[PDB]
């Protein structure tokens, strides 16, 4: 549960966790200020993103990221990573000579913010193109949707 597990403690540049204190009390009673901002296209910031205590430079809400260029989606297959879920999208290419199609898929890696917790295997996740923050990952998770889930036994 410790936010300080890395070599150097990460700090949100905008916020000022360090504040003076008054007599008969302390600023530690109240939680630290959290900097976040919602996005357009109806991308309302989910509950865990506001009230979470996590700190991430690369999160869609508490970071520098601006989502632009193209808005896409995909499914969830594997989750063995550090804050990355591998997704794959089906698309049918048309061949003129034989007047038919071929099933095709080009899977990519998306970096997921730690605020989203409820993701299982076989559900859709909506992602959007962003800056080349990594060498391979150029997308960020913006929405989580289930697919015949909400009941696991």
């Amino acid at each position: 549960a410790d936010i300080q597990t890395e070599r150097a403690y990460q700090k949100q540049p905008t916020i000022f966790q360090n504040k003076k204190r008054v007599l008969l009390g302390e600023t530690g009673k109240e939680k630290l200020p959290r900097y976040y901002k919602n996005i357009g296209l109806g991308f309302k910031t989910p509950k865990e993103a506001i009230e979470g205590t996590y700190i991430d430079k690369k999160c869609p809400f508490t970071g520098n990221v601006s989502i632009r260029g193209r808005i896409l989606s995909g499914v969830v297959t594997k989750m063995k990573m550090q804050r990355t879920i591998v997704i794959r999208r089906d698309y049918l290419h048309y061949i003129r000579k034989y007047n038919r199609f071929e099933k095709r898929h080009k899977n990519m890696s998306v970096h997921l913010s730690p605020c989203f917790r409820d993701v299982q295997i076989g559900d859709i996740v909506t992602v959007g193109e962003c800056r080349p923050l990594s060498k391979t990952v150029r997308f960020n998770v913006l929405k989580v949707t289930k697919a015949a889930g909400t009941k696991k036994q």
């Binding site: 357009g40 296209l41 632009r68 808005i71």
Partner: protein, 262 residues
């Protein structure tokens, strides 16, 4: 390529440029200026090819250092200066004034205007920024940045600017029911009234424009150019009111004119 290419070819010319194919392998490359070259016009092409005042590119240079050509009240020696949209070229020796605007055929036509009309102009803003010392400024499509604008002016508005004063005289917002002309794409060169507008958070917007003849069409925001208020433009217009007539209709008037003349 190792940097900025310094030549244009005969085929590299824009299509709406009326340049011949068998005269030369190069073209008069428009040099840098207040307009993107892909939608501008050099002085040589304006005079030699259109007005037929000069027959060779050398002769166009001859009159330029004779300093008989003026643009926006300023004498420019650049033969390849980018005379872009809303540029007025006035020749005092012949006492003629031309307003450079698009015609019904999406072409950079030459339209004669009165000197009094040439004294003022019309420009479109692009962005608003609070520059030095906390005051606003406007950057336009003409790259004529203006200090201390009217605060009521917003993005995509049209500001009247005089040649000598170079200031804001009359501004008009962007709204429905206002006359506008398309500045790109397939509908380039059409005049109509904005009937509708739809927005998209993350892509371009679409403004539906319906002209006087009922030929409705749709256009992108970046190709909208506001000229006048309501149904009356602030400036004169060329033949056809900027209305694109069909292939069959145009040939009908063409044959009628031929028969009447003959």
């Amino acid at each position: 390529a190792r940097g900025p290419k310094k030549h244009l070819k005969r085929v590299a010319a824009p299509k709406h440029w009326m340049l011949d194919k068998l005269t030369g392998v190069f073209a008069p490359r428009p040099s840098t200026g207040p307009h993107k070259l892909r939608e501008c016009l050099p002085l040589i092409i304006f005079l030699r090819n259109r007005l037929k005042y000069a027959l060779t590119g050398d002769e166009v240079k001859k009159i330029c250092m004779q300093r008989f050509i003026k643009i926006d009240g300023k004498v420019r020696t650049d033969i390849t200066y980018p005379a872009g949209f809303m540029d007025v070229i006035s020749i005092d020796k012949t006492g003629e004034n031309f307003r450079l605007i698009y015609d019904t055929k999406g072409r950079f036509a030459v339209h004669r205007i009165t000197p009094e009309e040439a004294k003022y102009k019309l420009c479109k803003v692009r962005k608003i920024f609070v520059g030095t010392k906390g005051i606003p400024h406007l950057v336009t499509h003409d790259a004529r940045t203006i200090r201390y604008p009217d605060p009521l002016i917003k993005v995509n508005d049209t500001i009247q600017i005089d040649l000598e004063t170079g200031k804001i005289t009359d501004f008009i917002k962007f709204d429905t029911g206002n006359l506008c002309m398309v500045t790109g794409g397939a509908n380039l060169g059409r005049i109509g009234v904005i009937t509708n507008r739809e927005r998209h958070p993350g892509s371009f917007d679409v403004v539906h424009v319906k002209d006087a003849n009922g030929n409705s069409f749709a256009t992108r925001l970046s190709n909208i150019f506001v000229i006048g208020k309501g149904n009356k433009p602030w400036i004169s217009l060329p033949r056809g009111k900027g209305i694109r007539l069909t292939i069959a209709e145009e040939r009908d008037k063409r044959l009628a004119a031929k028969q009447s003349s003959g």
